Structure formats: structure tokens, C-alpha cells
């Protein structure tokens, strides 16, 4: 059944753009560095504009999948795959298309040593990440998710700063592969029952409570590694710290979102009965991760480790929201996911600004920076506040909505989750003050440069996006509520 | 000002001394004024409606 | 001090004494007053006073929303 | 004297984004990334500034508001 | 292309929906799920319209709100019990 | 005198590397056994039962039986 | 400010984070006594039972204690 | 002491519920004087003095009612 779309801008062209960029960049000699830079940046920017147009034609009254286009695999047509988005995946496509040009711009100065391999790796990552978010099939979702492991492994290992990147890349690859292997088993068990992997059909098929429980456990084994939930989160600090800056931006801003996206797209709607049974279990794991990892963050001494550990606590608050199973909880969970991809990405950009100049991540060396880099200090303070979920910032909207949705279900989990307001404030301000405030230490650092024109421009869309969501989240919530409402109602008829 | 053995004290500005004395004098008068208008009331001697 | 003279900042750093600070201060005055004009117009458009004041008040000169929410069983 | 004697900073301390000014009479060279980025930034505001304010309001909230208004009208005038 | 105007939906529940075995007509199952979501959103807007009434009664009547808005508060509080997807089921 | 890179301190870097390599120091002592038992096992079970009990107390407030959980 | 001390001895743990004359548990005992003053004072307030020596009768408001004016059934 | 100000007069005067007591009929002139005179303390001394006397009269009445009740608590004890 050729369910092709009538719109002019569709998902296939968006998936094809960065692929064309990579193919063209395959054949350009490494002496034409200017041309390589320009072509990569332009391909990413056109992809961003294309995704913005997809936003423009979005229809916010339907709970159906929009811009659905079919892609055929066999002329037998037994196995035929569909692409489409709804209010739950649209903004994540947008976020991917926006973060990739940032990743290219961050490594602009070193592009004479990075080479076309760096741009091609990021453009290939873009294609797979956009595709993952646009899949209406369990099997294609699985296959595209693992494809990102190859370029992410390459990015971490080749362009990481020090040789701990070896261990980091190994751990990342092995943990993620294990998780994806448990998902494969569940996909093949689903396919044994239903004879299909088409998501829309699965949303209309009934599962037994026993097999719902079991298949939910099989999905959890992958998603909890992706989120990450305790105690399988220890790969994250190594991988996100040893990666290059743009690698950290992609890892924390997009790849982390895949486990929570998988909870919203597959487990929660497809197995409603099992989801209710495991709700105290998810509540306990998330609450422990929020309290415990926030306290570990307090005692970290590496700049990138503090930011990496903060990401774990923010993502477990997201899981409390999505498993609250109401408009505020799921609505807040998606907004926090988007906000985190901007705030943590900006924070990894601040640390990279410091590291590119002085080549150290230890907090003890820094301090006093407000007297030499006031521009960086002001930008760093703003994203420090956004990381504390200050009202008026994008992160406060998602945070409070999740707490609202949790309070209406279980007042205890909402209380433990609200403890991150105290803990998250403690490590964010302690980090900012030890780096920016105080006096300089000329025996460690004596030569300083504030942000240049490229770094300031890089920070601009992050400030605008954070403010825009923090003061007027209605432009996002309006386009989501119809898909959110039907996700909550899935499996009940009263 | 006046010097007494090393340590010198400068005289205050004239309007500073005038305002200080004047504001407290305004305060002392307002206190005596009020105490005679509603002093028996707070002592409990009479009541406001007495008359 | 010595190195802070080579450091750019939005607030001007230490002991900022711009030579033309008076014309810049007066230009800054005008910008705020020009910014205030749309704000005041929008404020006057948005205010809601369900109660007539006991005496005439300065906001009856520009605001036309006095005694309007009497029909409350119609508000949506 | 702080209000009647002008300041001494003929030019502000430091340089904006730490770039030395170009030679007198000369214009700064734009780096290769500026033009594509400033065109993307301009097109971003134009698409979102116009498109979001020009797309129709199809929220479930706007449709239900109108629907709920008529049902409360229809149960009030009728008993 | 799309015609201008507010979205249009069927007023009535889909015909073909057996509430005894909801997983027998899937096209109707999906359409019932969408219809219930739309119906629930209508009651949500109902309580919000009713809430605007309580607000302006308090603002208009002041110290006399307990007697003058007794009826509106009852209506709002009844509409909010069992509303949306909150702390009440049906 | 030369460069923007930090002048490394041998003592501060040693403190940094000893932090990264903590897993080589774990020994399975008495204190660790108490700490892992209390905060790795006992406390999560306490939070789990508190959350379940919170749901159950709601069930008997609604005149409903105790909802089953995995 | 003047000259920041550069370490010359191997840095120990709990250095990122590193009340003089009075000991730890002795301060807890003195604060506990201070809070025990509020406890004893509060108990004395119960023992006093001022509510039982009220020198006037509870206010009575007209119109059934303003039953309608307080949101009751009219 | 009998109730004078009807329910409608108090509601139209927008009297705080805690001041809708037996002396409400005198509060209405007082508050109308207070608003018209910007609540300065040297104004409306006449309406204020009249209303305060009524409120003093009310509290003394309830004080005397308890003065009685207290004289019967001991009667029960003196005969127990």
C-alpha cells in the first residue's frame, strides 16, 4: 500500500540532504579545506531550514501520524516500511537538525587537522538520528539506532583529547550494543505473534498481561541503558567526558533522548497494562538516580564530569514525568527532553571554550575568570541558571509540569523528585563560583582570551531558544497536546 | 577643626548640626503633643467617647 | 588596573568614565521613553477595573474598561 | 566634579569579541562562516516569525473551546 | 492543500465499536480513542469556562463572594471532579 | 611565559588521576559491605515499598482493592 | 589575592571542600537544651490552660451567625 | 441591643464579614466618612467615637455574661 504524501516538503528529502552532503564530501581533496567546511556547513544549515518548514506545515488537530510516506523493501510488499511524525517526535527532528550545524561550527578552527572525516562523521550521524526519530516500525527503529554506534565510536576514539577515550569508546559501544540486543529479541518475539513490525498495527493489537509484562522488561533492558537509569549509567561519565566537544553535544543532546523516546513511542502505548504494573518500579529507580547521582555530582572535580552527571539526574526526572501518564507529566517530560538538549549542549560548549584554550578540565586550576573573560562568565552564568531550572528558563517549564503530573499520581515520588531543586542548585552554583568567581591564579593560568565572534554566535540560538521556551512554551505545547492526549488515553475507553 | 596632640577632630558641617537638633526637637515636641492628646486614653483614665 | 584596560565588558569594567557619557545618558533616556510609549498604550488597553472609583482618578482619562465585568455569569 | 568634568576614556577598554580593529579606512574581513550563518539566522526568524503566525490555529484547545461554548449555550436556553 | 477554518470532526461515536471486546474492530477502536480524547477536551474547556465565571464573580463581588457566587463555585467544583486525566478516573 | 595552556601541577594532577582510577581500590571490606547493603539494597527497597504503600492507601481511600504491581 | 598557595604535598581526598572552641556533640547538647526551653515553655502553656479562663462569651453574630453570608444554604 | 442594619445594607456597604455585628448600622456612616476623608485620623472623630462606644458596649455585655457563668462554676464546686 503506497501511502505516499501530497506535501511538497517531506521526510525523504530531509533524510537525503546530509547523505548527499557526505557523498559529495567523499571526493574533495583534503587540500580544499575551505570548500569542505563551506559544503558541510551549508548542507547542515539547509537541513535545519527544511525541518523548520516541516514545523510550519504541521497539523496540530490530528492524532494520526503526519507526512506519512511509505518505502518499499520487497516487490512482494509483505514487508513495507513507513515514515511519519507526530507531536511527540517533530521537535526532536528539529533539535537534531539544529544541533548538527553547531557541531560543525565548534570545530571550525581545527578543521585543517580534523579533515573531511569529521564533517562526514557528523553528517552521517545526522542522517541516522533524523531517520531514527522518523520511523514507524520497530525493526527499522532498531536497525537505525545501532547504525549511529559506528560513527559515534569513531568520533569519540579519533578526536578525543586523551587516551582514556579508548576505554570510553569501548564501554559506550558495548553497553549500547547489549541494550539493543535485548530490544531485538523483543522485536522478534513481537513479530512471532503479530507477523508484522508496523507500529500503527501494533498500536491496534491486544497483548496478554503475561506477555505484556515480559515484552516490557525486554524493552526496558534497552531503554534504561539509553536513558540511562541506575545502575547501568556508569558508561555515560566516561563517554561524555572523553569525547570531543561536538561529540559531547551530540551524545548528551540527542543520543540520550533515544531511550525516553523509545519509552514514549513503544513501551508505554503498546503495553498499557504492564506499564501500570511497573510504575512503582520506575518511580523507585528514577528517585534513587535523582538523589544519588545529584550527590555524586557535588563531589566531582572535573568540569565535564559535573555536567555529564547532571544529565543523568535530569533524564531520570523525565522518566518520572512520562510514567505519570497524564497531560502534564508527558507534556513536561517532552519539554524537559528538548530543554536538556539545549541547556546541556550549551554547557558542554562553555567547558569546551575553556578547554580549547587552557587544556585542562580540573576545577582547581580555574577561578577568577570573571576578571579576564566577562563575556564568557555572563553566558556561563545564564546556562548555569537554566541548569538549576530557574523560572523563566526553558528547563523550569518541563520540570514543574513533571512535578505536577507526579503529584497527581503519587505524592511521595513527586516529593523525592522535588529534592533535585535543592541538590541541582548546590552543584551548579558551586561549579560556577569555583570557575568564574574569586581571584585568578597566575601560577596555573596567566594568558587569557574571551569569546571570539564565532563562539558568541554559537551561543546566540541557545539563549534565544532557552528564553523562548521559558516564557512562551505555548508554541510547543499547542503542537503536542493532541498526540500527548491520545498517548495517555491509549488502551482505555472511558 | 581642632587638634589635640596628634589626633585632630574636624567640626561637623553646620547644616548637619542644625538638621539633627531640629529633627529630634520636632520628635520630642510631637511626643509631648501626643501624650497630652491621647495619654489618658492609653492609661485607661478616660475613653475617646467621654464627653 | 593594568590588564583590565584590555578587557571588553558590557558594563564597562572598573572605573568606567566614558568621555561622552552625558550625551549617551541622554540618548539612553530617550530610548526608555520611546520604549515606554507602546508599553503604556498596551497597559491602558489591557487594564480591567470592575469597580467605579469613589472619586475621579487619572486612569479614567485613558482606560475604557470601567464597570465592564458586571455580567460575570457570561465570562468564558 | 564627577558630573561637570567629562570622562577620560576616549575609546572603550578592550575590543568587542577581542578582535583588533582593521586599518583606518579599511573594513573587517568576514570569515567564511558568517554569511551562511547570518542568512540562516535571517531565514529562521522570517520562517518562524511569519509561518507560526500565519499557520491556522488547529489546536485541540481552540476547537474544544468553541465546541464547549455551544453546548453550554445549548443546555442553558433549553431548560 | 487544506481548506481554511476550524477542524471538523464527527459529533457521534464511531459505529462499529463493541465496548465488550474493544480489540475486534481496530479502525473503530482507533476512532473511539480519538473521539474520547476530543470529548474529554470538551469537558476540560467546560471547567475552564466555568472557572472564568468564578474568577470574575470574586473580583466583582468582593466581600460578598461567598453568598453571590455560591452557585458558580458548586458548578465549577463539580465540573473539575472527574475532569481530564487528573486524580479521578471516569 | 609561553602559551595559554595551564602550567601543570604534579600534586594536583596526581589527585586528579587517583579520582579517575577509584575502581582499582575497591576491596570488599566490612564498611563497604554495610554501605552497599544499606544504600544499595535496603534503601531502594524502603523507597519501593513506600511508593507501593502510597498507591495502596489511595486504593482504600477510593473504596478499591489493592492494585497489583509486578 | 597576594600569592595563591601552589601545593607541594600530595593532595588527599575531601580537599575540594577544605565552630572552633566548642565541640561537635557539646554544641548539639547546648542547642538541644535551648530547644528544650521552648518545649518546656510550650508544656507550661498547656498546663496554664488560658482557654479555660476566658473573661467573655464567644461572639455571636446575627442571622444564624451569618450562615448565608459565609456560603451556607440560603 | 437589637439588630438594625438589614442584610442588604451590609452587603451594599461591602462590610467585612467580621464587622457585621450589632454595631453595623453605625459602621456604614463611619466607613463612608473614612473613604471621603482619605482615612486621616483627625477626621470623622464623631462617627468613630459613636461606633467605638457601641463596640465597647458589646464586649462589656459578653464580659458580664461570662462574669455570671464563672459564678456558677464555683457554685457547682461549692456544692459537690
PDB file of N, CA and C in Angstrom, chain B:
ATOM      1  N   UNK B   1      39.211  72.087  61.888  1.00  0.00           N
ATOM      2  CA  UNK B   1      38.891  71.503  63.177  1.00  0.00           C
ATOM      3  C   UNK B   1      39.861  71.907  64.268  1.00  0.00           C
ATOM      4  N   UNK B   2      39.888  71.126  65.346  1.00  0.00           N
ATOM      5  CA  UNK B   2      40.761  71.362  66.491  1.00  0.00           C
ATOM      6  C   UNK B   2      41.715  70.187  66.628  1.00  0.00           C
ATOM      7  N   UNK B   3      42.988  70.484  66.865  1.00  0.00           N
ATOM      8  CA  UNK B   3      43.991  69.455  67.090  1.00  0.00           C
ATOM      9  C   UNK B   3      44.328  69.404  68.569  1.00  0.00           C
ATOM     10  N   UNK B   4      44.214  68.214  69.138  1.00  0.00           N
ATOM     11  CA  UNK B   4      44.657  67.933  70.493  1.00  0.00           C
ATOM     12  C   UNK B   4      45.634  66.772  70.376  1.00  0.00           C
ATOM     13  N   UNK B   5      46.922  67.109  70.302  1.00  0.00           N
ATOM     14  CA  UNK B   5      48.069  66.190  70.401  1.00  0.00           C
ATOM     15  C   UNK B   5      47.992  65.024  69.415  1.00  0.00           C
ATOM     16  N   UNK B   6      48.204  65.352  68.141  1.00  0.00           N
ATOM     17  CA  UNK B   6      48.308  64.342  67.108  1.00  0.00           C
ATOM     18  C   UNK B   6      46.968  64.076  66.467  1.00  0.00           C
ATOM     19  N   UNK B   7      45.986  63.752  67.295  1.00  0.00           N
ATOM     20  CA  UNK B   7      44.656  63.417  66.808  1.00  0.00           C
ATOM     21  C   UNK B   7      43.868  64.703  66.605  1.00  0.00           C
ATOM     22  N   UNK B   8      43.393  64.912  65.381  1.00  0.00           N
ATOM     23  CA  UNK B   8      42.640  66.101  65.010  1.00  0.00           C
ATOM     24  C   UNK B   8      41.183  65.716  64.795  1.00  0.00           C
ATOM     25  N   UNK B   9      40.268  66.549  65.277  1.00  0.00           N
ATOM     26  CA  UNK B   9      38.839  66.346  65.067  1.00  0.00           C
ATOM     27  C   UNK B   9      38.313  67.511  64.249  1.00  0.00           C
ATOM     28  N   UNK B  10      37.637  67.198  63.151  1.00  0.00           N
ATOM     29  CA  UNK B  10      37.017  68.214  62.319  1.00  0.00           C
ATOM     30  C   UNK B  10      35.616  68.513  62.827  1.00  0.00           C
ATOM     31  N   UNK B  11      35.289  69.796  62.891  1.00  0.00           N
ATOM     32  CA  UNK B  11      33.949  70.190  63.278  1.00  0.00           C
ATOM     33  C   UNK B  11      32.945  69.729  62.221  1.00  0.00           C
ATOM     34  N   UNK B  12      31.753  69.306  62.626  1.00  0.00           N
ATOM     35  CA  UNK B  12      30.745  68.900  61.644  1.00  0.00           C
ATOM     36  C   UNK B  12      30.225  70.094  60.858  1.00  0.00           C
ATOM     37  N   UNK B  13      29.672  69.799  59.681  1.00  0.00           N
ATOM     38  CA  UNK B  13      29.046  70.831  58.864  1.00  0.00           C
ATOM     39  C   UNK B  13      27.877  71.451  59.621  1.00  0.00           C
ATOM     40  N   UNK B  14      27.681  72.760  59.431  1.00  0.00           N
ATOM     41  CA  UNK B  14      26.690  73.483  60.225  1.00  0.00           C
ATOM     42  C   UNK B  14      25.284  72.937  60.002  1.00  0.00           C
ATOM     43  N   UNK B  15      24.895  72.727  58.740  1.00  0.00           N
ATOM     44  CA  UNK B  15      23.539  72.272  58.463  1.00  0.00           C
ATOM     45  C   UNK B  15      23.319  70.855  58.947  1.00  0.00           C
ATOM     46  N   UNK B  16      24.377  70.057  59.082  1.00  0.00           N
ATOM     47  CA  UNK B  16      24.239  68.747  59.706  1.00  0.00           C
ATOM     48  C   UNK B  16      23.846  68.883  61.167  1.00  0.00           C
ATOM     49  N   UNK B  17      24.472  69.822  61.873  1.00  0.00           N
ATOM     50  CA  UNK B  17      24.137  70.034  63.274  1.00  0.00           C
ATOM     51  C   UNK B  17      22.745  70.637  63.413  1.00  0.00           C
ATOM     52  N   UNK B  18      22.376  71.541  62.503  1.00  0.00           N
ATOM     53  CA  UNK B  18      21.067  72.186  62.589  1.00  0.00           C
ATOM     54  C   UNK B  18      19.956  71.175  62.358  1.00  0.00           C
ATOM     55  N   UNK B  19      20.086  70.364  61.307  1.00  0.00           N
ATOM     56  CA  UNK B  19      19.043  69.398  60.979  1.00  0.00           C
ATOM     57  C   UNK B  19      18.890  68.352  62.077  1.00  0.00           C
ATOM     58  N   UNK B  20      20.018  67.847  62.586  1.00  0.00           N
ATOM     59  CA  UNK B  20      19.985  66.835  63.655  1.00  0.00           C
ATOM     60  C   UNK B  20      19.217  67.333  64.860  1.00  0.00           C
ATOM     61  N   UNK B  21      19.607  68.500  65.391  1.00  0.00           N
ATOM     62  CA  UNK B  21      18.910  69.063  66.543  1.00  0.00           C
ATOM     63  C   UNK B  21      17.448  69.334  66.219  1.00  0.00           C
ATOM     64  N   UNK B  22      17.189  69.860  65.021  1.00  0.00           N
ATOM     65  CA  UNK B  22      15.831  70.229  64.663  1.00  0.00           C
ATOM     66  C   UNK B  22      14.906  69.037  64.534  1.00  0.00           C
ATOM     67  N   UNK B  23      15.390  67.978  63.886  1.00  0.00           N
ATOM     68  CA  UNK B  23      14.530  66.791  63.635  1.00  0.00           C
ATOM     69  C   UNK B  23      14.177  66.124  64.966  1.00  0.00           C
ATOM     70  N   UNK B  24      15.157  65.950  65.848  1.00  0.00           N
ATOM     71  CA  UNK B  24      14.859  65.366  67.181  1.00  0.00           C
ATOM     72  C   UNK B  24      13.966  66.318  67.988  1.00  0.00           C
ATOM     73  N   UNK B  25      14.174  67.638  67.930  1.00  0.00           N
ATOM     74  CA  UNK B  25      13.278  68.561  68.622  1.00  0.00           C
ATOM     75  C   UNK B  25      11.854  68.431  68.102  1.00  0.00           C
ATOM     76  N   UNK B  26      11.701  68.307  66.782  1.00  0.00           N
ATOM     77  CA  UNK B  26      10.395  68.031  66.192  1.00  0.00           C
ATOM     78  C   UNK B  26       9.830  66.735  66.760  1.00  0.00           C
ATOM     79  N   UNK B  27      10.709  65.763  67.016  1.00  0.00           N
ATOM     80  CA  UNK B  27      10.297  64.477  67.566  1.00  0.00           C
ATOM     81  C   UNK B  27       9.871  64.597  69.023  1.00  0.00           C
ATOM     82  N   UNK B  28      10.655  65.315  69.832  1.00  0.00           N
ATOM     83  CA  UNK B  28      10.307  65.483  71.240  1.00  0.00           C
ATOM     84  C   UNK B  28       8.984  66.214  71.396  1.00  0.00           C
ATOM     85  N   UNK B  29       8.780  67.269  70.608  1.00  0.00           N
ATOM     86  CA  UNK B  29       7.524  68.006  70.662  1.00  0.00           C
ATOM     87  C   UNK B  29       6.345  67.127  70.269  1.00  0.00           C
ATOM     88  N   UNK B  30       6.475  66.385  69.166  1.00  0.00           N
ATOM     89  CA  UNK B  30       5.386  65.528  68.709  1.00  0.00           C
ATOM     90  C   UNK B  30       5.025  64.488  69.760  1.00  0.00           C
ATOM     91  N   UNK B  31       6.008  64.069  70.557  1.00  0.00           N
ATOM     92  CA  UNK B  31       5.749  63.110  71.625  1.00  0.00           C
ATOM     93  C   UNK B  31       4.981  63.771  72.761  1.00  0.00           C
ATOM     94  N   UNK B  32       5.423  64.958  73.186  1.00  0.00           N
ATOM     95  CA  UNK B  32       4.706  65.676  74.235  1.00  0.00           C
ATOM     96  C   UNK B  32       3.308  66.049  73.773  1.00  0.00           C
ATOM     97  N   UNK B  33       3.184  66.486  72.519  1.00  0.00           N
ATOM     98  CA  UNK B  33       1.876  66.811  71.967  1.00  0.00           C
ATOM     99  C   UNK B  33       0.940  65.612  72.035  1.00  0.00           C
ATOM    100  N   UNK B  34       1.392  64.456  71.542  1.00  0.00           N
ATOM    101  CA  UNK B  34       0.524  63.283  71.502  1.00  0.00           C
ATOM    102  C   UNK B  34       0.165  62.807  72.902  1.00  0.00           C
ATOM    103  N   UNK B  35       1.140  62.805  73.812  1.00  0.00           N
ATOM    104  CA  UNK B  35       0.901  62.295  75.159  1.00  0.00           C
ATOM    105  C   UNK B  35      -0.159  63.115  75.883  1.00  0.00           C
ATOM    106  N   UNK B  36      -0.343  64.372  75.479  1.00  0.00           N
ATOM    107  CA  UNK B  36      -1.351  65.202  76.129  1.00  0.00           C
ATOM    108  C   UNK B  36      -2.703  65.083  75.437  1.00  0.00           C
ATOM    109  N   UNK B  37      -2.735  64.509  74.231  1.00  0.00           N
ATOM    110  CA  UNK B  37      -3.996  64.424  73.499  1.00  0.00           C
ATOM    111  C   UNK B  37      -4.696  63.098  73.756  1.00  0.00           C
ATOM    112  N   UNK B  38      -3.935  62.009  73.818  1.00  0.00           N
ATOM    113  CA  UNK B  38      -4.495  60.672  73.993  1.00  0.00           C
ATOM    114  C   UNK B  38      -3.661  59.881  74.999  1.00  0.00           C
ATOM    115  N   UNK B  39      -2.985  60.592  75.894  1.00  0.00           N
ATOM    116  CA  UNK B  39      -2.305  59.966  77.003  1.00  0.00           C
ATOM    117  C   UNK B  39      -3.257  59.363  78.016  1.00  0.00           C
ATOM    118  N   UNK B  40      -4.283  60.085  78.559  1.00  0.00           N
ATOM    119  CA  UNK B  40      -5.238  59.443  79.479  1.00  0.00           C
ATOM    120  C   UNK B  40      -5.956  58.231  78.869  1.00  0.00           C
ATOM    121  N   UNK B  41      -6.119  58.215  77.544  1.00  0.00           N
ATOM    122  CA  UNK B  41      -6.820  57.088  76.861  1.00  0.00           C
ATOM    123  C   UNK B  41      -5.989  55.810  77.032  1.00  0.00           C
ATOM    124  N   UNK B  42      -4.673  55.880  76.801  1.00  0.00           N
ATOM    125  CA  UNK B  42      -3.843  54.681  76.863  1.00  0.00           C
ATOM    126  C   UNK B  42      -3.548  54.315  78.308  1.00  0.00           C
ATOM    127  N   UNK B  43      -3.630  55.294  79.210  1.00  0.00           N
ATOM    128  CA  UNK B  43      -3.515  54.989  80.630  1.00  0.00           C
ATOM    129  C   UNK B  43      -4.786  54.337  81.154  1.00  0.00           C
ATOM    130  N   UNK B  44      -5.899  54.543  80.442  1.00  0.00           N
ATOM    131  CA  UNK B  44      -7.193  53.973  80.871  1.00  0.00           C
ATOM    132  C   UNK B  44      -7.967  54.935  81.752  1.00  0.00           C
ATOM    133  N   UNK B  45      -7.443  56.150  81.955  1.00  0.00           N
ATOM    134  CA  UNK B  45      -8.128  57.176  82.785  1.00  0.00           C
ATOM    135  C   UNK B  45      -9.513  57.478  82.203  1.00  0.00           C
ATOM    136  N   UNK B  46      -9.575  57.858  80.922  1.00  0.00           N
ATOM    137  CA  UNK B  46     -10.883  58.137  80.266  1.00  0.00           C
ATOM    138  C   UNK B  46     -11.022  57.344  78.961  1.00  0.00           C
ATOM    139  N   UNK B  47     -12.128  57.559  78.243  1.00  0.00           N
ATOM    140  CA  UNK B  47     -12.385  56.852  76.961  1.00  0.00           C
ATOM    141  C   UNK B  47     -12.580  57.887  75.847  1.00  0.00           C
ATOM    142  N   UNK B  48     -12.327  57.582  74.553  1.00  0.00           N
ATOM    143  CA  UNK B  48     -12.415  58.605  73.498  1.00  0.00           C
ATOM    144  C   UNK B  48     -13.790  59.235  73.388  1.00  0.00           C
ATOM    145  N   UNK B  49     -14.849  58.468  73.636  1.00  0.00           N
ATOM    146  CA  UNK B  49     -16.223  58.937  73.517  1.00  0.00           C
ATOM    147  C   UNK B  49     -16.707  59.691  74.748  1.00  0.00           C
ATOM    148  N   UNK B  50     -15.857  59.789  75.777  1.00  0.00           N
ATOM    149  CA  UNK B  50     -16.236  60.501  77.029  1.00  0.00           C
ATOM    150  C   UNK B  50     -16.427  61.989  76.727  1.00  0.00           C
ATOM    151  N   UNK B  51     -17.614  62.523  77.023  1.00  0.00           N
ATOM    152  CA  UNK B  51     -17.912  63.916  76.759  1.00  0.00           C
ATOM    153  C   UNK B  51     -19.402  64.131  76.607  1.00  0.00           C
TER     154      UNK B  51
END
